[PDB]
């Protein structure tokens, strides 16, 4: 599923992402936007280390979810990576929350540092009623 901007902003809000661990909704929208273009089916195989990124947040299989084919990987969110390919983003949100409870916070995703940090992200939630 490819979410429409405001539809997604409210979906995230309903799920408790607004200010979760100090992270604003616009920061989460910016992350989803640059990670998958709001596409829940997005996937990226990293031939270099044999891992795969799944879903709207492009969560990596090496540490966060189990796909059974990533060498010596762990499953910190305790979820099948398949859970990250559902149209319903609740499990993906639960996993994204788990990622940010770690030391780096939102900085866990290099794309956020690259395209959201110290950027004006107002545009992501404008007029969404969030």
Walkthrough of the structure:
- The chain is an alpha+beta fold.
- It has one domain: Lysozyme, CATH 1.10.530.
- 30% of the residues lie in helices and 8% in strands.
- The protein contains four helices and three strands.
- The protein has helices at 5-14, 25-36, 90-100, 110-115, and strands at 43-46, 51-54, 59-60.
- It has a three-stranded antiparallel β-sheet with strand order 1-2-3.
- Helix 1 (5-14) crosses helix 2.
- It is globular and about 45 Å long.
- The two termini are 21 Å apart.
- It is classed as hydrolase.
- Keywords: surface mutant, hydrolase.
- It forms a monomeric assembly.
Summarize the structure in short:
It is an enzyme of class 3 (hydrolase). The protein is α+β, with helices and mostly antiparallel strands and 130 residues long.
Please supply descriptive tags for the structure shown above:
130 residues, alpha+beta, Lysozyme, 3-stranded antiparallel sheet, 4 helices, 3 strands, 30% helix, Lysozyme C
- Give me the CATH fold name: Lysozyme
Structural class by SSE content? alpha+beta
Tell how many strands the DSSP assignment holds: 3
Helices, by number, come to 4
Domains (count): 1
In the CATH hierarchy, the architecture is: Orthogonal Bundle
Strand order of the largest sheet: 1-2-3
- Taking the alpha carbons of the first and last residues, their distance comes to 21 Å
The major sheet is characterized as:
3 strands, antiparallel
Secondary-structure element pattern, one letter each: HHEEEHH
User: Rg to the nearest angstrom?
Assistant: 14 Å
Instruction: Sum up the overall morphology in one term.
Output: globular
Approximate strand percentage:
5-15%
GO molecular function: identical protein binding; lysozyme activity
GO cellular component, one term: azurophil granule lumen
EC number: 3.2.1.17
Enzyme class: hydrolase
